[PDB]
Amino acid sequence: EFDAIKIALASPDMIRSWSFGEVKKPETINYRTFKPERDGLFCARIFGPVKDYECLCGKYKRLKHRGVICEKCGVEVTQTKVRRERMGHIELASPTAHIWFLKSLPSRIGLLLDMPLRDIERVLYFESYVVIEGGMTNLERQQILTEEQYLDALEEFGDEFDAKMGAEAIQALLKSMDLEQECEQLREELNETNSETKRKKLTKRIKLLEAFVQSGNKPEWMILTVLPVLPPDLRPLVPLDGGRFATSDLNDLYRRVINRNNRLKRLLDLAAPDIIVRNEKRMLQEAVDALLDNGRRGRAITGSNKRPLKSLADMIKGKQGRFRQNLLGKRVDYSGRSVITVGPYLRLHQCGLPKKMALELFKPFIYGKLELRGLATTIKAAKKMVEREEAVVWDILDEVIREHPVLLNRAPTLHRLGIQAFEPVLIEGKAIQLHPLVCAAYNADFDGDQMAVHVPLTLEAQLEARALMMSTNNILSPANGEPIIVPSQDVVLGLYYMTRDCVNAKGEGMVLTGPKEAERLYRSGLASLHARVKVRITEYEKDANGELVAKTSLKDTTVGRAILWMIVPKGLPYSIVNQALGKKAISKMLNTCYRILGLKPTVIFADQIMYTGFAYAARSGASVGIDDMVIPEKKHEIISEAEAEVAEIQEQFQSGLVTAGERYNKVIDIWAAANDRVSKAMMDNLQTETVINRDGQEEKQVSFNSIYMMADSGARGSAAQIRQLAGMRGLMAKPDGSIIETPITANFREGLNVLQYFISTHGARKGLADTALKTANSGYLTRRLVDVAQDLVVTEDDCGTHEGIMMTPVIEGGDVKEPLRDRVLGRVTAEDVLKPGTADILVPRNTLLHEQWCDLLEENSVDAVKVRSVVSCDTDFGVCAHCYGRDLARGHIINKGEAIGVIAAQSIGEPGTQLTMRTFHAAAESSIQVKNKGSIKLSNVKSVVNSSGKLVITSRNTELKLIDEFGRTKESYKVPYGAVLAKGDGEQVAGGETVANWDPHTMPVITEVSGFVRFTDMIDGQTITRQTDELTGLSSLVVLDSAERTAGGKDLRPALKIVDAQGNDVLIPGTDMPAQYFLPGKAIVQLEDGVQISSGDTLARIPQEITGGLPRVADLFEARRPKEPAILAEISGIVSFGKETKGKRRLVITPVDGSDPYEEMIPKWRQLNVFEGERVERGDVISDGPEAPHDILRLRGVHAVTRYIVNEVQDVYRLQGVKINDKHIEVIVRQMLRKATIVNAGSSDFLEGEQVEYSRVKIANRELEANGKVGATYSRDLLGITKASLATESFISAASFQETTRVLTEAAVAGKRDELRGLKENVIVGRLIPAGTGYAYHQDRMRRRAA
């Protein structure tokens, strides 16, 4: 019906056009008869009849009189629903300013009138005068005059100047001005001006003027003369007990406005004095402001409840506004809610629904079936029968729920799997029965959790539930591709107990014909479940053709394993069950079953596994007792030894040999060692406590202790918890993070005294408080991510782009967190991968890397692979399947129409709770040590050989890589400047050897040539001081910076020169400039004048001197500037220091051949890594510190900033052991990089300084190039998630997120038109979203619009 939504400010004529009448009285209800009053807020003549097809007077009360207006009372005879649409208007006696265009920064009135907002407020609220027309006098036009100044001007000139006071003056000023003349004058002033602040103000005003001119808006329309009113049905008077009626804030505000307007009218008609009418006008303006926005200016008007009333703006914005409370989310019918219990008999696709819930939810279906089958003749009869709960009603209910899926959803819907479709099964009781295997997907436990159920109605919804949202379809996590259906607590324990062996059990050593005989023997009691026997196993394997071929053989196994083999499908081998089946073993067996056979056999196998595990866990009867937590007999001895050691340390400290800090460190180390020894002894005792007499000989076997069985099987518990149960609790930390000297040496089996419990309460409370406070931050971050990535869907198959990002394994000096296989798994390559050293292709250009391709890549020792990335997708208004990659939920490539952005946002947001928010809390090693054996490679290094033959680094950014024999870069290290090298490039090294040593305390100055040292331009007492040492007494020279040096020493630059025997400088090898080394401030020199030095000798020494998980993730995704950002070189060239001003250092970068327009003002306390005359490239660190993402994008490109962001986010998430694919982070990064600022206008019409969408620039450039014209140059800009979300083409999405007032004001001023492209806009409107099954339908619309 409609294709787009247009928003603009309303003219008084159009406002009058909307209204069906004029409201002139504040009366609402007679309160004697409930008929509405005439000409009031509730009026039948203006808005509509109260009753359907009835007249207020009562002359006409039938459909036959439809559309004819009565003459006695003037009430049209239509449906009463017209009261929801018809509006009215109020004719203000005096003009009133609109608050949304008044106090919403930037102030539109102030910006357009170019005069301060406080002057606007003063003249508007009737406190001063402003001149509409200055005239031929000294008074300027836009001059603000107070009362006595106005009187002086009036007595000076009676009528030469015309000054008014109030909103009428503002309206006259807005109307008198000319938009085109002002715009051209502003443009010609901006062309000649040069001030940056003036340029910004002028361009902002130019943008506002152009927006006003292009649209049909008029400035005078920003001052209200006619006030629209809401339809009565949208502000109803809710009836209450008796004659009381519910109060509505909007009604009170409208009544106050009407009363003020009537009083002003009666004062104007009576020719009241100026003071009274001015006060009335001011109070009317305040009332209108309160109606539009209560708390925007001044104190909000309070009602009878001693609280501010809800204005029009208050009920549209915010979390409780119409956008977020009734449009994006809403209450639905055919829904219920109940607690959840566990149903062990249910299948993976089934759920248990109570009879009453199903009867209530499926009522219309029961009515229809009863009417069809003839048990009832009318709807009333069916209602009575279902109320009486007849026998046939139950049969009908069973019939209607045979294959009708129901959507089960938990209250926190963190990710996609929070709502799933299940087949209902009628059950008694009052609690919903949920399948255990899906609980991990729901993050639901049976401790009192509740779930909601929804009933799809149409055939399409049922088919989507069956095919898309069914439980069986959801088997892999979309976040990382890991399986989501794994046994957790009892299945694992049962399978572990069943698949175990005892060295001497009942019926051991016998031979069985097959698994059936084993089951018969176990059930008959003639054999034990752990008896080691030999059974005849027939296993089927898949050949090359896929046919199943059987192999029958005698296998040495246990009775339990043979019994479990019965439920294993035919295609699987016997090696999976011939072992103790823990959680990992069961997960691996399920993965193999899924990989070999398919989906349905995997589901059946999982159900059978759950049933068998539950049954045999029940049969085992495993229980936990006080005797199961065995305390080692050596714990007392270890504790006594530790106490003796700490007593000796305390005695040494009292003697004075060791100070407090090192004594505390040694005590902590001793207690940690004691705890480790106790834990090791307890684990050794527990793991093999059981000893069995086999043939009269004692034999050691794995213990059958229930606690140890639970720990080993992986059901519940871990090493730390078992250690706390049976060993000492270890050291504990104070709330500030400091470790307490005395640890908790008491087991949980034993008694913890009061002090130990009080100590542990600190950590317990800290953890609980962090968990409680994490939820709000996680939810806010998830909402921001969902918004910023709501409109991204797959709309194409292949861009054809040859660009992409290069993926390599991540290593930081000792560890390989993520090998290449996981990084490049399921991603389409961007270029042919050449075989290393042969220049032969290994994989084609556009092949998706599945498991076989990854195996081929890893077997050929490939380190770097360039793959297509979402951030490099050439598709506009969406991405492509090839550039995105394989879908993580389904192994195949992703399909068109999938909402990748929402999935990515949910996948990132969901593990937010697992992170940490509260901040937590030796010196850095001075040398680099190699942990493996391989070659050494040096990257970005300009080194020199010293006198001893060692190599010293003269480059700031130097990479030292340890490479294995296969060419894989196993280790990476960052070598600092002025670092000596034990071994050079290309030389093999042994494990544990040290290859680089350096001093981090101070930075030295290294000479690249050898010769005598000559001094240049230092004088004692001006630039250098020769200070004697405290003990040696040698006079070393210290250079003072600009703070200490005098004016005479300002231009004196200290320098050291390397000279030969002649006495002149030695020319630098490869550089015409001679060897000069300038000494910066606070530089200490030890060598004396004329001392011969070799290459690499240190001329002088310069002395040299976080956030948790969720805050760091939020800062990274918001592109927040760090407190002390690293200073980077904008352009490549030589460095030079200029004159110092403002307590700052001047930096000049001189390119080899280019111009020199770039200068920098480094803060004084910021350390300078670069020297006086070194060469630096683009994106080179001048001052150490955190790197601002904007600087990285500006100086290194999109790929570099994307890599930095994904690396930081992945590091933060991996610190907590969370696996998230990089596709989601890349999608978020691409969504952040959506705007670009022009540089050269070119043939395009874009303004030079304008910032516009990147897709629009790309389309315009493509169109211009297609015609042979020239394009436009652009620079991409980085925006935060909220900033990018607000700055989007669709104003509906921006207004529904946050800052609704500002977004709506800007859209109204600019006259923006929003086309309904995206998920949020279509959800708000109510049509099908352009994603998923509806996506194709939307394409049809795109086909119809073109035709």
């Binding site: 045979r402 088919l463 989507e464 095919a467 379809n473 349905k600 068109k896």
Partner: protein, 83 residues
């Protein structure tokens, strides 16, 4: 009965237009009074449509061809009645 739709998904190949095709077939059975191409094992309309989609008897092209044939025969019948 039906527990998974993987074979139907691979028969269609997208899993998004499969829902649309199954919905069209189910509407044809339930509203148009058509007859299933598979034995009716008391299953629901959607399950029957998916089951008959699984063995390749129903797809978008087949449904379009049958609709075109029905339209042409109805047009021929009404033209003969008019004449």
């Amino acid at each position: 009965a039906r527990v998974t739709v993987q074979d139907a998904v691979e028969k269609i190949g997208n899993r998004f237009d499969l829902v649309l095709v199954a919905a069209r077939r189910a509407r044809q059975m339930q509203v148009g009074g058509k007859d299933p191409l598979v034995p009716e094992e008391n299953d629901k309309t959607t399950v029957i449509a998916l089951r008959e989609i699984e063995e390749g008897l129903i797809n978008n092209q087949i449904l379009d061809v049958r609709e075109r044939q029905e339209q042409q025969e109805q047009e021929a019948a009404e033209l003969q009645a008019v004449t």
